[PDB]
Paper text:
Each of the Orc1–5 subunits bears an AAA+ or AAA+-like domain and an α-helical winged-helix domain (WHD). Among Orc1–5, Orc1, Orc4, and Orc5 each contains a functional AAA+ domain for nucleotide binding; in contrast, Orc2 and Orc3 only contain a RecA-like subdomain with no predicted ATPase activities. Away from DNA, metazoan ORC resides in an autoinhibited conformation with a closed and constricted central channel to preclude DNA binding.
Thereupon, a new interface is formed between the HTH motif of ORC2-WHD and the β-hairpin motif of ORC1-WHD. The limited resolution at this region did not allow an independent assignment of the side chains contributing to this interface. However, the involved motifs are highly conserved among the metazoan ORCs, a comparative analysis of the interface could be deduced from the crystal structure of DmORC. In DmORC, the equivalent residue of HsORC2-Phe524, that is Orc2-Phe566, is inserted into another hydrophobic cavity formed by five residues (Leu905, Ile892, Glu894, Lys903 and Glu851) from the β-hairpin of DmOrc1-WHD. The neighboring Arg563 and Glu564 of DmOrc2 interact with Asn907 and Arg889 of DmOrc1, respectively.
Author numbering:
A (entry chain B): 269 to 466, 471 to 560, 562 to 575
B (entry chain D): 14 to 89, 91 to 146, 152 to 388, 396 to 432
C (entry chain C): 9 to 16, 27 to 31, 37 to 85, 98 to 164, 193 to 506, 548 to 615, 625 to 664, 669 to 709
D (entry chain A): 760 to 861
E (entry chain E): 4 to 83, 91 to 244, 249 to 268, 295 to 328, 349 to 433
The structure:
């Protein structure tokens, strides 16, 4: 990845002047956006090249006076819990409730109906991603952004990007749609996702999840439950093959020793289970952190 | 009279409350194995932690309370402080800690600080007890107890039983067989092995004797003539071969010594109004009220539209076999049968036939695995349907011809 | 990575901002308030049936539970407004115990009961001046012992998105004890009452009492709000027929909603008020007369130099052209009467347009327009008497001359006899001119000849194309069709197709110079069945080897591979090729 | 000592014929999985062969939960009721020795 | 409240005998199954109301959580104060001992009646075997009275429990359904004549539903309609032959119109979705059993057959995709890959064919030879 990226930007993007000019067409379009956003509209703008630098120049030239929660969506840390948490502390200048997402949603709704002219507006790079969307996820953004005192600006990238909006979900934010093209390569996405030529984020576990049997999905539920239940015990050196065999056999997920061994060696291919030989010679099993293991089978059962 | 109410009061408790009747059979060697172990763990400071496994409905609780009562009869009240736990109530660690706090009368000293290491918690409980001393831990329903998140109240009891040397018996009561294989390896390797009981039943001609010794009016005297009359009636019923027939039939379904209590309990409920000495036929119908066919009572009560529907599902096995069907193939087979018939009584129209389905789902004879024309599953037997259709009292001839065609 | 910065109004940007923005705020706020009033008036016939039904079903309580399933339209955009109006009406004439449930705040039963009792607690504690189930019954028992125990109603907004389990358990819980707590639910069925059989199984479906109501089918809702909103003389801002055609087409084809149409009208008004510096005087006529008389002279040169006025310059004589070219003092005088003529053309236009609508809606098969909307369309796309459609009306209207035509001449005359002095001054006194024709309706040739003079005077006199007939018409008319359509309803799937297939922006690239990525996609779909990785890498390597030599091979292979993998991550990323897992490698042609 | 052979040795008659039905279906299929109606049919055949009365499946499922409680076999839930996939917790030669020794 | 029995006397008598008098023990747990019609709460409430065995009645439909189920049991029991709170089960067993130490109920066998226990089945795995052993768990002379829709054989925890005593409440007989379906309270006729009506109606109607509640409802509907031509026209046979023509249609009729106006492209969307759901064994190539149901199919195939159906001025705008999302919320189309991604999954069609036929015919399209033939 790194030695691949040393060769990045060596010599010669094959046009520069029309690229600066095509970006320089869009700088006249900004005061229209400010006025249009003051009236309660919401701007999505799509594109073929990188436009988040245009958004950064935009908030440099016209958002020196207001609050802005610059929510990136390309790197795999962000879900909407972080959005609500950061907008609770770092905007409202005190912490809120902690019981549920809808409680802090309703509470952060409730803070703005009484406090006039607080004038907060975030903006989101890459509203459509593998992580940011979701019917639980997007509606919180919508219900948040439906108010008079919140003005989101987004950027969608995908071909099937307006498929995650029904009309009622569309009517929460008054969309109008801009057209942009920059041709700049999306260096933040391509930096912080992955590179195939070389911990693991949610995409490859989603891909192995959708290419396998549901019983293997129930098997890794068991193995990740036994890992997450004993995460801060330093003496927990992993289950053996026979303990995992009897605790998988009790839940009817598999029938035979050889089937579970073939399942274990095909899941040892994807580098999400590492064998550790103890002083017995028996190879115990432990996978490569803890906080990224709660997200899946949190969301696999909502 | 005095006799009928007194015999009902005195027999009803030892039957159906499983009250401590003093006769115990088949368990004398395991009891004698337990007793001196309990006496040397109780009379001396040493702590050994025996374990009992048997099937459900037999043995365990009666044995441990009987040995407990006989040990509590011996003084020096010996200050053994027994603590009764169950696997069912105390599901978690925080509940179990305050339950031991409840049993040991701890709340004179307040102890209102949650400690991190729960070995220090348990040691504090034992510590404030020991400065204030034997205890006996009766850990009932151990298989549910083996599902803690961290197996604290399993393992720390074993560690204190070896390490604190306060007098302790961790007596586990289990029901599943593999208590060792279910136990996690640090605890099962740690101190699970004290000598393990096994518990099983015995032979039928002594089981007729345990029927007689169970049924007979005790050495407690309500009135001695009525005791003699009734337990002679018990023995006269005991020597009759039809009682022996239904008892052997009960043996081969049930080696349980709990099913005998219910089977005889219904018989004793019937007796006190008239003929206070009862028949073998009264024992026979008392066995008969313990039902055998739970689903024939369901299917026999159903109306005939559901009957021809359920034999249409049976017919859906006997062509195009082994799929979880939907409504439409059921509708097609029903229409093909009713177009095989000439009369137009039973050509009931489509929304009526949905009502029999959504009534039939609540009996769970059909199973869901889209909303109304999908993938429904049948869980049933042919032969109970074939017996039920001839036992339908107002069974019409056309569904009889459907049954014979099939 | 959501980093926040803390910071630690009348800006619009000639067309000077302050009164421009106040003109905007006044016109849009006026239009929005009258839009809501004309919403709430139309549903009175609907829900004043409903107050009767709920009063009858409550009052006979001395086994059953009443449901009134509304059949609202497919437009979920405007379902909030009807429920607000219905909540208001049911709160006034019936009980102050009205709550509403949304089917997104209650996935399961605990949320259902908790939010229901919270809404009920605030609704009862306001106008008198907790997870528990029978405490709600205790709240009903405490809070209303009197006033003949007014019935609590709940409003399920969406019947459809509810899960069946929590709804079934709520209906059985409520039907168990309505001895105290009489509850009358009204779920809003989005589709049709078929699906209340689908979502509720028959035991729960048998437990209740169904009485359905219709709702306003949306075409004769939008004829009212289009007809009152823009077809009147009253609102100072009209619209171009093509922009209106765009708006009504994306109503009728895609959206079937009215709130989206008002958003499109709001956007059109906003963009018009951005657009041109003569838009400031979009007012009523004395408010136009206010500061026509004082204004900056370059905007008066703009009022000279807009092309419809230069057409008027082209049709006129020199001796007033030499003073009216440059001098402001006469230019005010002629443009004032031009704006009066604009209002004049509107005022004699629209009333006889409605007259023609009544006279054409009476016809069998109605070949001109189905409704009042499309009559605006047919008299502005083509010229109307040039077009074959009004030729077909004129061919139709001859032998329709019977007492149906005379009776509907009387009836249409009666409805604009209500509009006789509701126009109240006509620009040619056309009300009593046409009424002086229309007063001989009581006393079979006369319908024919009176028809001839009426449509000829009517349509040849005023009913004409508004741009060319009227100079200074730019101030009232906003026209930019495919500038607006892409703002309102865009197509990124066409945009990526265009800028990927033909990324020609202005030097030579139209059918190899200045992509990296369109090289990758175009060469991906030069082998247009499927692809594996390495041969595709060699093909891209070949074409940029051609790019290199039309301006060592191992370093070139390295830099070509690096820019290849930078291209191919984006070509995965943008909705094309999905990764083909567990194989050696390939990519899958997901979009054709 | 192993608990399981002593449990089979002191099991009842219908349990022993149920295990015989289990191993008979395991001789027919060869597999370790079996549904409840298959071994129910085998159990019907064996109770026919022994002069026993008719094995009603309320009794047979009560005896299924009897043997599933004691972990001689491994049981699906009783909600599935005819569709219970059962596996044998003990090896087959063990239960053959346990019903073969007398 | 009035008639305790209406001729189901033997099950009533064996249950009444099984309770016994107050000062001695009874069964731990009794389970009563049967059909939903079969009087299973009528019989036990009119039985318990006679002797006034001090009991608590619950429904498990009402208590959706465990805490409410314990709270109302303890709160209703102590009346026979504040909300005596119990978060857990062991708190209930703890406070139960203090509650059942009153002289109204010190020796009396307390009955905890549990109605519709199949909803308790999926409450927890703890609560049902914890409730079956309550006679020796707390040891305070209790008897937990179960009744259920469902069979005990699915109801067992698959570990074993204390097996309760099981009754089968029998179904109602035919002549008993003549008797107990309101031979008492006929207001204005002879009881012979109302019995003659319902005797005629019942033997016709004893094949669809034996539920006494809805049959009481249908009899009290169609009896005054039967009763008016006797008291107006005036002989049971003639109005028998008049009442059965009304009875067939009243049977059949116990859904206004299926047609729904739609925006025009949505009409064409679900036309295309039907047409690519119901014959789709790669028969895209030809034009341009049925009974098993709809086959799922991806989105781009739907867009292709959409382009083949429509006049070709369509563009893939944002609104056509937003419309095709918004059709699924109205449940006319369904995504069957539940999470397979934001990119176009299989969308299978879920509307009936006649509704599809009306939507096709209201825009100029005859498609039935085009659909599967
Ligand atoms: N050998 C025996 N002597 C006397 N009574 C016995 C004997 N075996 C079984 N019983 C009776 O069987 C029942 C056993 O109940 P107990 O609770 O002691 O064991 P269990 O029911 O298997 O344990 P669990 O309640 O954990 O299932 C009691 O009714 C007891 O009286
Ligand atoms: N023998 C009877 N005599 C008179 N009415 C009866 C009789 N049996 C049932 N009913 C009617 O049935 C009602 C009680 O219904 P039932 O007792 O059948 O409910 P249930 O069996 O508990 O219902 P579910 O099984 O669905 O919970 C009573 O209100 C009464 O109208």
């Amino acid at each position: 990845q790194q030695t691949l990226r040393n060769l990045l930007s060596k010599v010669s993007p094959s046009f520069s002047a029309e690229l600066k000019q095509l970006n320089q067409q869009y700088e006249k379009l900004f005061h229209k956006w400010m006025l249009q956003l003051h009236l309660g509209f919401n701007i999505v703008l799509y594109g073929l090249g990188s436009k988040r630098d245009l958004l950064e120049r935009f908030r440099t030239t016209m958002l020196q006076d207001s609050i802005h929660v610059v929510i990136n969506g390309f790197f795999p840390g962000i879900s909407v819990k972080s959005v609500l948490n950061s907008i609770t502390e770092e905007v409202l200048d005190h912490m809120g409730t902690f019981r549920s997402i809808l409680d802090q949603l309703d509470w952060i709704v409730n803070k703005f109906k009484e406090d006039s002219s607080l004038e907060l507006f975030l903006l989101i790079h890459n509203l459509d991603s593998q992580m940011l969307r979701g019917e639980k996820s997007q509606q919180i953004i919508g219900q948040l952004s439906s108010l008079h005192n919140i003005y989101l600006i987004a950027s969608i990238d995908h071909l099937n990007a307006p498929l995650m909006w029904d009309h009622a979900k569309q009517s929460l934010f008054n969309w109008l749609w801009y057209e942009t093209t920059t041709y700049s390569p999306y260096t933040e996405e391509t930096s912080y996702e992955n590179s195939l030529l070389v911990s693991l984020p949610l995409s490859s576990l989603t891909h192995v999840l959708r290419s396998l049997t549901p019983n293997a999905r129930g098997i890794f539920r068991l193995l990740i439950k036994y890992q997450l239940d004993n995460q801060d015990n330093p003496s927990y050196i992993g289950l053996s093959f026979q303990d995992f065999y009897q605790q998988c056999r009790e839940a009817f997920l598999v029938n035979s020793d050889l089937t579970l061994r073939a399942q274990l060696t095909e899941f040892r291919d994807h580098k999400l289970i590492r064998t550790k030989k103890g002083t017995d010679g028996v190879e115990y099993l432990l996978i490569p952190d803890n906080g990224t293991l709660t997200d899946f089978l949190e969301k696999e059962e909502e | 009279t005095e006799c009928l109410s007194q015999v009902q009061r005195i027999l009803r408790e030892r039957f159906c409350r499983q009250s401590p009747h003093s006769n115990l059979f088949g368990v004398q060697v395991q009891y004698k194995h337990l007793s001196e172990l309990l006496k040397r763990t109780a009379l001396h400071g040493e702590s050994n932690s025996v374990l009992i496994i048997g099937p459900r409905g037999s043995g365990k609780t009666m044995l441990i309370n009987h040995a407990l009562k006989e040990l509590m009869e011996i003084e020096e009240s010996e200050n053994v402080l027994q603590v009764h736990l169950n696997g069912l109530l105390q599901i978690n660690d925080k509940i179990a800690l305050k339950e031991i706090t409840r049993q040991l009368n701890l709340e004179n000293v307040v102890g209102d600080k949650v400690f991190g290491s729960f070995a220090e918690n348990l040691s504090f409980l034992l510590e404030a007890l020991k400065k204030g001393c034997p205890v006996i831990f009766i850990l009932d329903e151990f298989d549910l107890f083996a599902h803690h998140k961290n197996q604290t109240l399993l393992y720390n009891l074993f560690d204190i039983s070896q390490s604190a040397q306060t007098p302790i018996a961790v007596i586990g009561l289990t029901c599943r067989l593999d208590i060792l294989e279910l136990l996690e390896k640090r605890v099962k390797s740690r101190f699970s092995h004290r000598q393990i009981h096994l518990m099983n039943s015995f032979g039928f001609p002594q089981y007729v004797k345990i029927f007689k010794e169970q049924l007979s009016l005790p050495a407690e005297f309500p009135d001695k003539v009525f005791a003699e009359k009734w337990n002679e009636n018990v023995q006269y019923l005991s020597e009759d071969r039809s009682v022996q027939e239904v008892l052997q039939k009960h043996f081969n379904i049930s080696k349980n010594l709990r099913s005998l209590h219910m089977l005889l309990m219904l018989a004793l409920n019937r007796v006190t109004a008239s003929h206070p000495f009862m028949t073998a036929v009264d024992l026979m119908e008392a066995s008969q009220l313990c039902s055998m066919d739970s689903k024939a009572n369901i299917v026999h009560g159903l109306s005939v539209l559901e009957i021809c529907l359920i034999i249409a599902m049976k017919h859906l096995n006997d062509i195009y076999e082994e799929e979880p069907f939907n409504f439409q193939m059921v509708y097609n087979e029903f229409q093909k049968f009713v177009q095989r018939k000439a009369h137009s009584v039973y050509n009931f129209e489509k929304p009526v036939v949905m009502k029999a389905f959504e009534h039939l789902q609540q009996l769970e004879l059909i199973k869901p695995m889209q909303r109304e024309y999908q993938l429904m599953k049948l869980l049933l037997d042919n032969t109970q349907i074939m017996n039920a259709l001839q036992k339908y009292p107002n069974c019409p001839t056309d569904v009889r011809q459907w049954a014979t065609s099939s | 990575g959501c980093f926040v910065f803390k910071p630690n109004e009348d800006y619009f940007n000639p067309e000077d901002s302050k009164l421009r923005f106040e003109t905007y705020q006044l016109i849009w706020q006026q239009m929005k308030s009258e839009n809501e009033r004309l919403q709430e008036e139309l549903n009175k016939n609907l829900f004043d049936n409903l107050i009767e039904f709920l009063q009858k079903s409550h009052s006979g309580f001395q086994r059953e539970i009443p449901t009134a399933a509304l059949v609202l339209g497919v437009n979920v955009t405007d379902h909030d407004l009807t429920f607000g109006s219905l909540t208001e009406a049911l709160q006034n004439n019936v009980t102050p115990y009205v709550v509403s449930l949304q089917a997104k705040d209650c996935p399961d039963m605990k949320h259902f009961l908790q939010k229901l009792i919270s809404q009920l607690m605030d609704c009862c504690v306001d106008i008198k001046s907790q997870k528990t189930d029978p405490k709600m019954l205790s709240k009903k028992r405490t809070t209303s012992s009197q006033w003949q125990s007014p019935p609590v109603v709940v409003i399920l907004k969406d019947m459809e998105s509810f899960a069946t389990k929590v709804l079934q358990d709520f209906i059985i819980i409520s039907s168990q004890h309505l001895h105290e707590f009489p509850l009358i639910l009204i779920f809003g069925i989005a589709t049709s009452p078929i699906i209340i059989h689908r979502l509720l199984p028959h035991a729960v479906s048998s437990l209740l009492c169904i009485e359905l109501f219709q709702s306003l089918s949306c075409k004769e809702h939008l004829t009212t709000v289009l007809d009152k909103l823009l077809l009147t003389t009253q609102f100072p801002f009209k619209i171009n027929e093509k922009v209106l055609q765009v708006l009504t087409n994306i109503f009728l084809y895609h959206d079937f909603s009215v709130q989206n149409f008002i958003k499109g009208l709001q956007l059109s008004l906003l963009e018009h008020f951005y657009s041109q510096p003569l838009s400031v005087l979009c007012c009523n006529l004395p408010e136009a007369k206010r500061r026509i008389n004082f204004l900056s002279n370059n905007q008066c040169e703009n009022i000279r130099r807009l092309p419809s006025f230069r057409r008027y310059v082209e049709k006129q004589a020199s001796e007033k052209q030499v003073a009216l070219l440059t001098n402001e003092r006469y230019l005010k005088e002629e443009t004032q009467l031009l704006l009066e003529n604009l209002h004049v053309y509107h005022m004699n236009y629209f009333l006889v347009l409605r007259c023609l609508h009544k006279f054409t809606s009476s016809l069998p098969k109605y070949p001109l327009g189905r409704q009042i909307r499309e009559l605006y369309c047919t008299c502005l796309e083509k010229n109307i008497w040039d077009s074959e459609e009004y030729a077909s009306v004129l061919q139709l209207l001859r032998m329709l001359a019977k007492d149906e035509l005379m009776t509907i001449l009387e009836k249409c005359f009666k409805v604009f006899k209500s509009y006789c002095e509701n126009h109240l001054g006509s620009t040619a006194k056309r009300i009593e001119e046409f009424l002086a024709q229309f007063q001989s309706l009581d006393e079979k040739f006369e319908v024919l000849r009176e028809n001839v003079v009426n449509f000829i005077d009517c349509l040849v006199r005023e009913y004409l194309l508004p741009p060319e007939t009227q100079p200074l018409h730019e101030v009232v008319y906003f026209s930019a069709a495919h500038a607006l359509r892409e703002h309102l309803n865009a197509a990124p799937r066409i945009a990526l197709h265009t800028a990927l297939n033909n990324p020609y922006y202005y030097l030579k690239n139209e059918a190899n110079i200045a992509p990296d990525i369109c090289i990758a996609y175009k060469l991906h779909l030069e082998c247009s069945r499927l692809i594996n990785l390495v041969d595709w890498s060699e093909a891209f390597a070949t074409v940029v080897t051609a790019a290199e030599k039309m301006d060592t091979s191992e370093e070139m292979n390295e830099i070509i591979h690096a820019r290849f993998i930078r291209a191919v991550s984006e070509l995965e990323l943008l909705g094309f090729i999905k990764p083909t897992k567990q194989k050696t490698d390939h990519v899958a042609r997901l979009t054709w | 000592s192993s608990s399981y052979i002593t449990a089979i040795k002191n099991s009842s008659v219908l349990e022993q014929s149920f295990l015989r039905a289990i191993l008979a279906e395991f001789r027919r299929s060869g597999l370790e999985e079996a549904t409840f109606q298959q071994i129910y049919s085998q159990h019907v055949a064996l109770c026919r062969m022994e002069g026993l009365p008719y094995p009603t499946m309320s009794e047979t499922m009560a005896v299924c939960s009897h043997l599933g409680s004691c972990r001689l076999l491994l049981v699906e839930p009783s909600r599935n009721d005819l569709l219970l996939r059962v596996r044998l917790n003990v090896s087959q030669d063990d239960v053959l020795y346990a019903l073969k020794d007398e | 409240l009035e008639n305790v029995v209406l001729c189901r006397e033997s099950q009533v008598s064996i249950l009444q005998s099984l309770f016994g008098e107050r000062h001695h023990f009874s069964f731990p747990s009794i389970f009563i199954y049967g059909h939903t019609a079969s009087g299973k709460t009528y019989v036990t409430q009119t039985l318990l109301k006679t002797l006034e065995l001090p009991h608590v009645f619950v429904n498990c439909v009402e208590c959706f959580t465990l805490r409410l189920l314990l709270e109302q049991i303890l709160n209703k029991l102590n009346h026979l104060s504040t909300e005596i709170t119990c978060e857990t089960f062991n708190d209930f067993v703890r406070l139960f001992k203090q509650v059942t130490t009153a002289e109204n109920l010190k020796d009396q066998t307390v009955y905890i009646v549990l109605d519709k226990a199949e909803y308790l089945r999926d409450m927890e795995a703890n609560l049902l075997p914890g409730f079956l052993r309550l006679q020796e768990l707390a040891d305070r002379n209790v008897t937990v009275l179960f009744l259920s829709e469902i069979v005990w054989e699915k109801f067992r925890p698959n570990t074993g429990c204390f097996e309760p005593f099981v009754l089968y409440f029998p179904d109602y007989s035919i002549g008993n359904l003549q008797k107990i379906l309101s031979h008492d309270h006929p207001p204005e006729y002879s009881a012979d004549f109302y019995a003659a009506y319902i005797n005629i109606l019942l033997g016709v109607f004893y094949t669809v539903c034996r539920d006494l509640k809805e049959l009481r409802h249908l009899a009290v509907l169609n009896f005054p309609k039967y009763c008016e031509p006797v008291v107006k026209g005036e002989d049971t046979r003639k109005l028998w032959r008049n009442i059965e023509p009304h009875l067939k249609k009243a049977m059949q009729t116990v859904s206004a119109h299926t047609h729904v106006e739609l925006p025009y492209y949505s009409k064409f969307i679900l036309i295309a979705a039907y047409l690519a759901s119901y014959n789709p064994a790669r028969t895209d190539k030809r034009f341009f059993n049925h009974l098993l149901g709809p086959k799922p199919f991806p989105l781009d195939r739907l867009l292709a057959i959409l382009y083949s159906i429509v006049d070709s001025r369509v563009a893939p705008t944002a609104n056509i995709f937003s419309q095709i999302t918004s059709l699924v919320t109205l449940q006319l189309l369904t995504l069957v890959g539940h999470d397979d991604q934001l990119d176009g999954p299989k969308y299978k069609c879920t509307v009936s064919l006649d509704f599809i036929r009306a939507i096709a015919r209201t825009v100029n399209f005859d498609i039935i030879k085009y659909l599967y033939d």
